[PDB]
Write a structure and sequence with these properties.
Blueprint: H1 7-10, E1 23-26, E2 29-32, H2 37-40, H3 55-61, H4 77-91, E3 96-98
Antiparallel strand pairs: 1-2, 2-3
GO molecular function, one term: steroid binding
Keywords: Acetylation, Lipid-binding, Nucleus, Steroid-binding
Main location: nucleus
Length: about 100
């Protein structure tokens, strides 16, 4: 499989380090958004998503810190519709360096 990044490791790219890139989790998939760390990077548009899975937050589109779940273990249709689509938006934009595992 891919590199597969754990929530722990993935949480090491929320934008703040010097080299450490920026990886976002979506439905358990680690995506690359470093292309715009200005948004995800330390304190940015996706400050809550940085080093966190904003699947639910993406779905309902709340960007809530609690809506950031590394698992769709609840993601309803409302969020799924958007979340699921959010995947294509991020997947068809951000490079997948791996998929969230642990």
């Amino acid at each position: 499989g891919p590199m597969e990044f754990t929530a722990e490791q993935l949480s090491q790219y929320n934008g703040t380090d010097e080299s450490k890139p920026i990886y976002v989790a979506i439905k358990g998939r680690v995506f690359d958004v470093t292309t715009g760390k200005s948004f995800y990077g330390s304190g940015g548009d996706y400050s809550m998503f940085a080093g966190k899975d904003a699947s639910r937050a993406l779905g309902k589109m709340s960007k809530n810190e609690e809506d950031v779940s590394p698992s769709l273990e609840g993601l309803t249709e409302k969020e799924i519709n958007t979340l699921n689509d959010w995947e294509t938006k991020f997947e068809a934009k951000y490079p997948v360096v791996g998929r969230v595992v642990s």
